[PDB]
Design a protein around this ligand. Structure first.
Ligand SMILES: *[C@@H]1O[C@H](CO)[C@@H](O[C@@H]2O[C@H](CO)[C@@H](O[C@@H]3O[C@H](CO[C@H]4O[C@H](CO)[C@@H](O)[C@H](O)[C@@H]4O)[C@@H](O)[C@H](O[C@H]4O[C@H](CO)[C@@H](O)[C@H](O)[C@@H]4O)[C@@H]3O)[C@H](O)[C@H]2NC(C)=O)[C@H](O)[C@H]1NC(C)=O
Ligand SMILES: *[C@@H]1O[C@H](CO)[C@@H](O[C@@H]2O[C@H](CO)[C@@H](O[C@@H]3O[C@H](CO[C@H]4O[C@H](CO)[C@@H](O)[C@H](O)[C@@H]4O)[C@@H](O)[C@H](O[C@H]4O[C@H](CO)[C@@H](O)[C@H](O)[C@@H]4O)[C@@H]3O)[C@H](O)[C@H]2NC(C)=O)[C@H](O)[C@H]1NC(C)=O
Ligand SMILES: CC(C)Cn1c(=O)[nH]c2ccc(C(=O)O)cc21
Ligand SMILES: CC(C)Cn1c(=O)[nH]c2ccc(C(=O)O)cc21
Ligand SMILES: *[C@@H]1O[C@H](CO)[C@@H](O)[C@H](O)[C@H]1NC(C)=O
Ligand SMILES: [Cl-]
Lengths: 328, 327
């Protein structure tokens, strides 16, 4: 017996995910009243931070409604769909993107853009910016908003509901980029990389800054902290950072398999789990510079995205980039 | 006088002295003052903010792009003037809900936000259509035509003091602060009512700094090189806010025409106060220091605390509305 250090608990996620695999080889998808069982099953439940309590309690609900929609966003077959994760108060970040690399363009290559939002509700001491979000939505017509609590641990929900929106409203798009609103993207380089793709490599395309043999952080005071009570083992290969790039074909496969993967607090890992269940490994690509602080305008020519750029820098870097095929 | 600001201010004092004058181009000259390139040593190596500052110093003829004329139609006991930048939409809205609430008995409290321009030529995102929507909805945006930069915050003060002079002269008091500062508006109105009519008409309190001089480390945000300013700073109320009388505000605006703008706004206010022969009064309640204990009691007897995020402001205000029981 383990009298020294306590027995390592069986994690609630792994236990429920194997339970879910047998079911497949809907009480986990639309059950939206609190699942109070976890308060007994999960050891040490009442000391877990509040985000962990909410995640476990509402993990089996994902049929949230679309409050703001852009139905005609793909009335023309998109070659590339830009899906930017954003929060309600980030009006500056979103507008810089509309003016820089997030520009919608059109010849046979139509590029369209949407911003993915939840709610920042008053119960969480957020300022009421809803009427402003509507005005922004009527003006630019690129706001998607569902009625879930847009929190860090609900980002898997943001993934699934976006994928569901793809399947139900933009399934014809040839390609899909998804990422953060504080990243700079060389949409020129992307469209070039996309147009250089063999139809073979294009069908199952998924590329980004893939991290292998990673594990949940157990340091309680860290952002990406997951205790062994929640998840045990190592993460699958997953493309993290502020963006990855994939085909619309794989997007439909990703959506269908989401029903078979329980939500996970780290969204970029969840998309890797779905990739695993489909039999695929994300493709690491050197142009996905997760790291790089900051001139050197030639560097931005060679890359696909750099992480952490302020709204002014996004428009500055994109302005220089326009004539960059002379300075480099 | 080797340093430029001292020298031109000396030229400015002589101009305004009745004797020394006898042997508006410092207010309305809105072409670049190219003379600073020949006179300020090493001008070409000064950072761009110092360049634009020295070149356009002699201009403050900047018009109001968005006005709230009826803001002070009802005489206010306290005017809330908050310095803000265009994209700070969440900062302002959180204040509107927490401590910047406007209320009508005699102690009417009103609130304005003081904005310049974040123009596209500086690679800013165009949020004008959004800012105008905010003004229609909340009737509290004041926007002038000038580059809202750090070294231009003295301009924000002079133009605002002008706006008080024309459009809100009868306010009894004025709070002036940042948009990332929590202000116990309740404790403010209490303190203000505890004031004799003596201390209440030359009132100007805050986190006052004495014995202060310019930072000379080229890396600091508040760096000021010896070619620009030599000597100590006066007593000035630094930090994220201060509070004063509307009467003193009218005096301050009249004395701005005789003080060259300074790249640090907190210092420019004290310089105007020194020309009025007054001294800002230090106050314990202006804690630009406490930044996160977690007892709501720490907010009951403070005027102002810096800095807070927009969620933090709304949360602090709610716990404050019920701290009479707990504390
Ligand atoms: C991801 O996003 C989802 C979508 O919003 C979030 O899910 C919500 O989570 C919140 C909690 O953060 C849930 O709100 C809570 O619901 C509890 C149960 O509600 C039932 O009971 C009430 C009253 O009995 C009925 O009116 C109602 O119809 C339901 O039948 C309440 O007990 C909670 O009350 C809490 O707040 C009050 C004050 O507001 C306190 O006084 C209480 O003590 C208590 O603490 C609260 O209302 C909400 O139900 C969930 N929504 C859905 C659709 O499921 C996830 O939280 C989020 N995940 C993460 C990790 O952020
Ligand atoms: C505080 O806020 C004020 C108010 O906005 C700022 O003052 C403005 O500062 C900008 C520069 O930052 C000034 O704009 C510059 O004006 C120069 C002078 O233009 C006159 O002269 C030329 C030559 O005869 C004429 O062509 C022109 O029509 C004017 O008659 C311009 O030369 C500058 O042009 C720059 O941009 C071009 C691109 O268009 C570049 O290619 C050039 O190389 C050049 O760098 C520039 O437009 C503006 O005039 C100021 N406004 C006022 C009212 O004075 C302060 O800068 C700000 N202070 C701080 C510290 O931020
Ligand atoms: C680029 C971000 C805008 C992504 N994001 C998003 O869409 N919703 C989010 C909620 C919380 C956090 C966090 O890390 O705190 C981050 C979030
Ligand atoms: C809203 C506050 C942040 C104060 N502020 C303001 O009103 N206008 C400003 C321009 C620049 C800077 C800076 O710190 O660089 C700060 C500014
Ligand atoms: C999800 O579906 C169930 C089943 O009809 C329903 O009761 C519940 O309200 C739905 N949840 C949301 C958030 O709409
Ligand atoms: Cl903000």
């Amino acid at each position: 017996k383990f009298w020294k250090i306590s027995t390592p608990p069986e994690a609630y996620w792994n236990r429920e995910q194997e339970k879910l695999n047998r079911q497949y080889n809907i009480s986990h998808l639309n059950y939206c009243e609190p699942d109070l069982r976890v308060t007994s099953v999960v050891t040490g439940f009442n000391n877990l931070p509040d985000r962990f309590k909410d995640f476990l309690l509402y993990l089996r609900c994902r049929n949230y409604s679309l409050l703001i929609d852009q139905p005609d966003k793909c009335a023309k077959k998109p070659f590339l769909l830009l899906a930017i994760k954003s929060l309600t108060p980030h009006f500056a970040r979103r507008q810089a993107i509309r003016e820089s690399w997030g520009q919608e363009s059109n010849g046979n290559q139509t590029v369209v853009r949407v911003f993915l939002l939840g709610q920042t509700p008053p119960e969480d001491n957020h300022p009421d910016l809803s009427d402003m979000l509507k005005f922004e939505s009527e003006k630019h017509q690129d706001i998607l908003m569902w009625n879930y609590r847009d929190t860090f641990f609900n980002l898997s929900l943001k993934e699934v509901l976006f994928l569901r929106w793809v399947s139900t409203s933009c399934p014809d798009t040839e390609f899909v980029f998804k990422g953060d609103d504080d990243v700079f993207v060389n949409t020129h380089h992307i469209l070039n990389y996309l147009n250089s793709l063999s139809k073979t490599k294009a069908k199952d395309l998924f590329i980004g800054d893939v991290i292998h043999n990673a594990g949940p952080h157990r340091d309680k005071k860290l952002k990406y902290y997951i205790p062994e009570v929640v998840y045990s083992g190592l993460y699958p290969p997953y493309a993290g950072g502020g963006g990855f790039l994939y085909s619309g074909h794989l997007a439909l496969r990703l959506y269908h398999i989401t029903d078979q993967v329980h939500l996970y607090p780290i969204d970029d890992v969840y998309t890797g789990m779905c990739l695993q269940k489909l039999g695929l490994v994300p493709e690491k690509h050197k142009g996905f510079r997760t790291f790089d602080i900051e001139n050197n305008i030639c560097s931005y020519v060679d890359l696909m995205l750099v992480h952490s750029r302020k709204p002014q820098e996004m428009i500055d870097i994109w302005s220089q980039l326009q004539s960059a095929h002379l300075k480099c």
